[PDB]
C-alpha cells in the first residue's frame with residue numbers, strides 16, 4: 001500500500017518558494033541536513049542517558065554522506081532517533097506550519113533563504129538541489145517507512161521492505177540534472193569544512209568506484 | 211527537602227571555563243537562553259499537533275524578559291515544554307557530557323566561547339553574567355521544581371511551592387555585581403535586536419517602576 005497525502009498549503013507554499021526563487025547559494029542544503037541529523041543524534045543520545053536499551057537498535061552515533069554518480073543521488077544517513085509514521089506525516093517531525101510563517105515574516109524583514117534552518121524547516125532546503133527526495137526512517141517505536149515527494153503538492157508514505165536500518169534516517173536526494181557538483185568528493189568536502197566543521201558526530205564521506 | 215547533587219566532572223569543568231576565561235563578549239548569554247526557550251516552545255508545539263490537550267496547561271507560547279534592579283536579577287520566562295525532575299538532574303535536559311567534549315574539541319580547533327550553543331550546552335553561558343542561577347520549571351508530566359547552582363561543583367533540586375507556573379521554564383539570573391548593564395532596558399533591547407530578531411515567538415521586555 002502507498003498512501004498519498006497533500007501538503008498543508010503553507011508547506012506547499014514554502015516548497016514552491018524554495019524551488020522557484022532565484023538563489024545561487026544552494027550549498028547550504030547540506031549544512032541544514034547535517035544539522036538535522038545532529039539534532040536527531042542528540043535526541044537518541046539524551047533518551048539513552050536514562051534508558052540504555054534505547055541503543056539496542058544500534059550503539060554507533062554517526063553521519064554518512066554517500067554520493068552515487070550512476071543514480072545521481074546524494075544520501076545523508078544518520079543513526080539518530082528516527083521518525084515514526086506519525087512523525088513522517090507531520091511534515092517530517094517539524095513544526096512546519098508555524099516555522100514557515102516565521103521564515104516568511106523574516107524574509108520580509110531582510111532574511112535570506114540560507115536562514116531557513118533557524119525556523120525549523122531546514123529539511124525543505126533539500127529542494128534547492130533535488131527534484132525528488134526519498135526519506136527512509138526507523139524509530140524504536142515503529143516500523144521502517146519510506147516517505148517521498150517530488151513537490152507538486154503531495155507526498156507518499158509506505159512501509160519500506162528495503163534494507164533494514166536498525167534505527168535512524170536516510171535522506172536520498174535525487175539531484176537536479178544541473179546540480180551534480182554535489183556528487184563530487186572535493187565539493188562535498190569543501191562544504192562540510194565550510195559549514196559543518198564542528199558537528200559533534202563523525203561525518204564520513206564515502207568514496208565511489210571510478 | 212533540598213537534594214544536593216554533584217555536577218559530572220566535565221560539566222564542572224565547563225562551568226569553571228565559562229567563569230574563569232577572560233572573554234568580553236558576555237552578551238551572547240541572552241541569545242543562548244532565548245534560543246533554548248524557543249526550542250522548548252517548539253517542542254510543546256510539536257506535541258500539541260497530535261494531542262491538543264498538551265496545551266491545557268497554557269495555550270500561549272511566548273518568552274518574557276523580566277529585569278529587576280532591586281533584586282539584581284534578569285529572568286527569562288517561557289511557556290515551553292518544561293522539564294521533569296529527571297530532566298533537571300540530567301544537566302537541564304542537555305547532553306552536557308558529550309556536548310562539552312565537542313565544545314572543548316572545537317575550542318582547540320579555533321572556536322570561541324560564543325559558539326557554545328552549537329554544542330547543546332548554551333544554558334551554561336548564563337554563568338558569563340550570573341553568580342547564581344535558579345531555574346523554576348513545570349512539565350506536563352511532573353510537579354513544579356526549582357533547580358539552583360552557584361557553580362562550585364554542585365546544584366540543588368527541591369519542589370517549588372512558589373507561584374504556580376502552569377507549564378514552562380523560568381531562568382533567574384542573579385547577576386554579578388559588575389554585570390548590571392543587562393538590567394537596562396536599552397541594553398536588553400539592543401541585544402535582542404542584534405541576536406534574536408527572528409525568533410518565532412513574541413519576546414516581551416518588561417518595564418520597571420523607576
Ligand SMILES: CN(C)Cc1ccccc1Sc1ccc(O)cc1O
Pocket residue numbers: 033036037039040041043078080081082083084087092093094123168169171
Ligand atoms: C521528529 N523526531 C522524531 C526526529 C528528529 C528530530 C530532530 C531532527 C531530526 C529528526 S529525524 C530527521 C529529520 C530530517 C533529517 O534531515 C534528518 C533526520 O535525522
Ligand SMILES: CN(C)Cc1ccccc1Sc1ccc(O)cc1O
Pocket residue numbers: 243246247249250251253288290291292293294297302303304333378379381
Ligand atoms: C529537555 N526538555 C524536556 C526541555 C527543553 C528542550 C529544549 C530546550 C529547552 C528545554 S527546557 C529549557 C532549558 C533551558 C532554558 O534556558 C530554557 C528552557 O525552556
Ligand SMILES: [Mg+2]
Pocket residue numbers: none
Ligand atoms: Mg537547534
